[PDB]
């Protein structure tokens, strides 16, 4: 079988599933391919419950999702070494991904953020980084459409230090703060930092047939009742409308004609049997890591350097949010755990004139419950009886986790060369990232560390543990940079590859700037923009 369809989307993540749902909502036949298997939320919940408590204390977000050998994903507690990272800041790009129908949004914190207008003209405004191919106004309708689709709650009536001015209010209103968030907000307000609610793809009220969040505080890595948004919802909705989903479909090769248009693609099943797929329009929505890997791996005779790699920019300009963690015991109880895992963040330093010199930061407070961490730490101290219970209670009441993410400019040397030393069960080379944080982020962190120290001192923290390295934040952006010049970018403002007019890249790898906050909402907005472009093309 040749598996014909009008449009085939490689990757059933949030971007791929949203695009497929929008397409099938407009009378287009869509074939949805995913390298991973189908996943059930309840089974993931059971896997997390039976995960060892030490894997809950330290934030393991991949063990609940089994790593299939044909399409492995990152698992950093045994460090399966699927994603090899090199460079002076290799620790900053140990990104977590999940392969399957639903993608990495199976275990995200659902912090749906709208980029500031200056995030799309960073280069024109401050002289650093790259400019987006489109302005914020051109993405605002798609921002709102994505927010309505996933049900993004937020601080409807509030005034915020710049927060992407909205034409319409949020579909919901932000759920009330927990005790920890209120205490943190008061402390940082006394310290001069503005703690504001994080716009989340969470249900403060029943919505889309999904319940209100009971505050399980387990948004990372699975919400047992499904009160967040996951890409599996869009995948299910698209399948209900006629889209065909083929799990365990590892796309490995693409075929091109004389006009460089993509004519057909091929994928492997777990048994390494190749199936061919022919469609009018091809879309790759895999990842900021898997999409450049597929583009480089499927290099043809017409494209020796890789698909849509005429500019030699596929895999370059990879950015993320290098974060600095911090853990300590507050003098006053914080009782972390009430509500979501990420309810608030300090958006005071999301913009300013300082961005021409050093990166802008997003200081936040982690609201994950500390009972597991407190119990493990107290047991590690060799306490017994009543003292053990008192120590567990004190450590779970005073446990505080503080992070500080930054913005990294698109550096051409942050490559995604295919590894020449490692492969998987299908023989596909593992991705390999050479990550350098850069002087921008280093200068930003020089001040962010002082800010974290001030926050710790304000709470009178003890046992202050600070990460000496940079931590990842799973906002895999760049790899197929966007722009107007075909020789300086991979895709145009419509997320269509310059080399092949037949191919669309509906991933976060198209973004020209990492921004200061999480970037999946912008990914969804770009996917919906690409959906509009595809619909105009085919009709």
């Amino acid at each position: 079988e040749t598996l014909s369809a009008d449009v085939v989307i490689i990757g059933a993540g949030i971007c791929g599933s949203l695009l497929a749902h929008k397409l099938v909502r407009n009378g287009l036949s869509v074939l949805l391919l995913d390298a991973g298997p189908r996943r059930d939320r309840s089974q993931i919940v059971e896997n997390w419950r039976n995960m060892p408590p030490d894997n809950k204390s330290q934030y393991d977000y991949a063990t609940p999702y089994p790593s299939v050998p044909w399409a492995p994903h990152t698992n950093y507690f045994p460090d399966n070494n699927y994603l090899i990272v090199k460079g002076p800041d290799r620790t900053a790009y140990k990104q977590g991904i999940i392969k399957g129908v639903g993608g990495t949004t199976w275990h995200w914190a659902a912090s749906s953020w709208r980029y500031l207008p200056n995030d799309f003209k960073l280069h024109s405004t401050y002289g650093v980084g790259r400019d987006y191919a489109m302005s914020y106004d051109e993405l605002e309708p798609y921002y709102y459409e994505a927010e309505c689709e996933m049900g993004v709650m937020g601080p409807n009536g509030e005034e915020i230090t710049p927060s992407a001015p909205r034409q319409n209010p949020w579909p919901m209103t932000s759920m009330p703060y927990g005790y920890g968030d209120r205490t943190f907000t008061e402390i940082v307000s006394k310290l001069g930092f503005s703690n504001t609610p994080v716009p989340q793809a969470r249900n403060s009220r029943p919505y889309d047939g999904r319940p209100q969040c009971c505050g399980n505080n387990n948004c990372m890595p699975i919400c047992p009742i499904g009160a967040m948004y996951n890409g599996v919802y869009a995948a299910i909705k698209a399948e209900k409308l006629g889209a065909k989903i083929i799990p365990n479909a590892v796309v490995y090769a693409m075929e091109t004609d004389a006009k460089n248009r993509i004519t057909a693609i091929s994928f492997y099943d777990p048994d390494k049997q190749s199936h061919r797929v022919v469609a009018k329009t091809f879309v790759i929505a895999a990842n900021g890591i898997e999409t450049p890997k597929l583009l480089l791996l499927a290099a043809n005779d017409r494209n020796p350097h890789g698909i849509a790699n005429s500019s030699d920019l596929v895999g370059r300009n990879m950015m993320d949010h290098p974060g600095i963690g911090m853990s300590f015991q507050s003098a006053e109880p914080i009782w972390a755990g009430g509500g979501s895992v990420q309810m608030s963040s300090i958006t005071n330093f999301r913009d300013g004139d300082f961005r021409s010199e050093y990166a802008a930061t997003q200081i936040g407070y982690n609201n994950t419950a500390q009972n597991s961490r407190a119990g493990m730490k107290a047991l590690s101290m060799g306490l017994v009886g009543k003292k053990l219970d008192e120590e567990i209670r004190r450590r779970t009441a005073h446990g505080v986790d503080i992070y500080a993410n930054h913005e990294v400019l698109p550096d051409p040397n942050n490559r995604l060369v295919l590894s020449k030393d490692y492969k998987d069960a299908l023989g596909i080379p593992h991705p390999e990232v050479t990550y350098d944080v850069g002087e921008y982020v280093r200068k930003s962190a020089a001040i962010s560390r002082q800010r974290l120290m001030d926050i710790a001192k304000a709470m009178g923290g003890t046992e202050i543990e600070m990460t000496p390295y940079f931590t990842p934040n799973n906002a895999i952006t760049g790899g197929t940079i966007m722009g107007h010049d075909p020789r300086d970018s991979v895709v145009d403002k419509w997320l269509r590859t310059h080399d092949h007019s037949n191919l669309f890249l509906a991933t976060g790898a198209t973004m020209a700037a990492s921004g200061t906050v999480n970037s999946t909402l912008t990914m969804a907005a770009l996917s919906l923009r690409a959906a509009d472009a595809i619909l105009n093309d085919l009709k």
């Binding site: 298997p37 189908r38 996943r39 059930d40 939320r41 309840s42 089974q43 993931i44 919940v45 059971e46 896997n47 419950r49 039976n50 995960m51 999702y65 089994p66 399957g100 009220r205 029943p206 889309d208 047939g209 999904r210 319940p211 209100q212 009971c214 399980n216 047992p224 009742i225 499904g226 919802y233 299910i236 909705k237 209900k240």
Partner: protein, 413 residues
């Protein structure tokens, strides 16, 4: 509000003449899952072209009570005209005034109901009405009882038409007056017995509990779902406290219709102090897409134990109902439990909405198969609800299909 507005709210005409939350209101277009097909409610807004704007007082009274349209065609029994037949003339006049003056006209045609032969033609319904003994004199107050009892009976029978769904139907799909309020199957859902039977019905319910359930749909031992969700969130929650008290008073006087094999009340089933084993779940790790999780207790813990606690007693504040001592789980007929699992609970009272996520094939949170749903229901019944009740995959499939197909519907094949 005007008298006509209150009567329209009590009669729940806006629940079936409004196509869900959207579709204006009283504009028709709502699909009623009749046993032999789909019957669409007609437009009621006073539109002189697409509604009933040209209806006279006599024509409207005929349509409301005797089920005869303006042109002369018989309305389908989906109209509870067998219940509205005893409405007083003043009430009908007030309703007519409310429909003519207090609702803006809507010019939008409703889908035409197309039933299979011999139900295609709406002319044989005269013989059906003759056989159903529908005709009756308008309601009058019985002087043997007090005014509260009379008003409660009026609300239960004529206006709110509780017997439309809580009274079983005979072969001809006519009301079975012998088993008055004895419980009935209305498709995917089953309306329980609500007579004064201490064990089979609601005789053991406290007056405060019954009043709270009718007003809000939420009580410690029972939660309203499905047709009660709609009925309470559209009509009952807006009724005055006096009307609900009258309804409770009348219900307390309903003759009891005992059920076969009933020993304790549906809400008096104690929970078995048992649960699942965490240790046994270790082998099921690295086993996404739970198909090897055939254990009922493990399935309940994975899917349902997040909200209703592992012991089934629910949350402390009562937001998540206690499956132990719950009427839906304590029912001998597990139809309501299977329906709750398949479709969920969605009730918006006083602008505040609870929501069970659906767990059927069309679920967004966690789709479940018939075997998995049957196993979960069996575990819930054995441990938290009625032990004697049992659920098989065939029962779940039949509830999904819309309940038992009545023998009368088989005649259109």
């Amino acid at each position: 509000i005007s008298r006509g507005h209150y009567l329209a709210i009590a009669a729940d005409c806006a629940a079936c003449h409004t196509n869900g939350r959207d579709g204006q209101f009283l504009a028709g277009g709502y699909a009623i899952s009749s046993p032999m097909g789909n019957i669409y409610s007609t437009n009621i807004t006073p539109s002189k072209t697409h509604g009933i704007g040209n209806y006279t007082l006599e024509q409207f009274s005929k349509a409301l009570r005797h089920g005869i349209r303006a042109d002369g065609a018989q309305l389908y029994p989906a109209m509870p005209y067998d219940a509205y037949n005893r409405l007083t003339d003043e009430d009908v006049k007030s309703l007519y005034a409310y429909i003519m003056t207090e609702v803006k006209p809507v010019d939008a045609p409703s889908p035409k109901t197309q039933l299979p032969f011999p139900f295609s033609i709406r002319a044989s319904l005269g013989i059906w009405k003759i056989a159903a003994r529908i005709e009756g004199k308008p309601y009058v107050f019985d002087h043997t009882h007090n005014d509260d009892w009379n008003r409660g009976r009026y609300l239960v029978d004529e206006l709110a038409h509780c017997g439309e769904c809580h009274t079983p139907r005979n072969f001809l799909l006519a009301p079975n007056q012998s088993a008055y309020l004895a419980g009935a199957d209305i498709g995917s859902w089953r309306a329980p017995n609500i007579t004064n039977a201490p064990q089979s019905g609601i005789g053991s319910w406290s007056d405060q509990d019954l009043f709270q359930y009718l007003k809000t749909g939420k009580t410690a031992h029972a939660r309203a779902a499905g047709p009660m969700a709609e009925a309470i969130e559209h009509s009952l929650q807006y009724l005055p406290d006096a009307d609900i008290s009258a309804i409770v008073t009348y219900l307390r006087s309903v003759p009891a219709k005992a059920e076969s094999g009933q020993t304790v009340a549906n809400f008096e089933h104690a929970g078995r102090p048992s649960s699942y084993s965490v240790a046994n779940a270790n082998s099921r790790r690295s086993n996404s897409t739970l198909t090897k999780t055939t254990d009922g207790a493990a399935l309940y813990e994975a899917v349902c134990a997040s909200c209703h606690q592992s012991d089934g007693k629910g949350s402390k504040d009562g937001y998540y109902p206690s499956l132990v001592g719950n009427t839906t789980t304590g029912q001998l007929n597990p139809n309501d439990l299977i329906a709750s699992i398949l479709y969920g609970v969605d009730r918006t009272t006083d602008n505040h909405e609870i929501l069970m996520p659906a767990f059927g094939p069309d679920s967004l949170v966690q789709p479940l198969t018939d075997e998995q749903i049957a196993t979960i229901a069996d575990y819930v019944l054995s441990h938290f609800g009625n032990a004697q009740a049992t659920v098989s995959a065939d029962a779940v499939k039949q509830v999904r299909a819309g309940g038992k197909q009545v023998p009368l519907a088989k005649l259109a094949s």
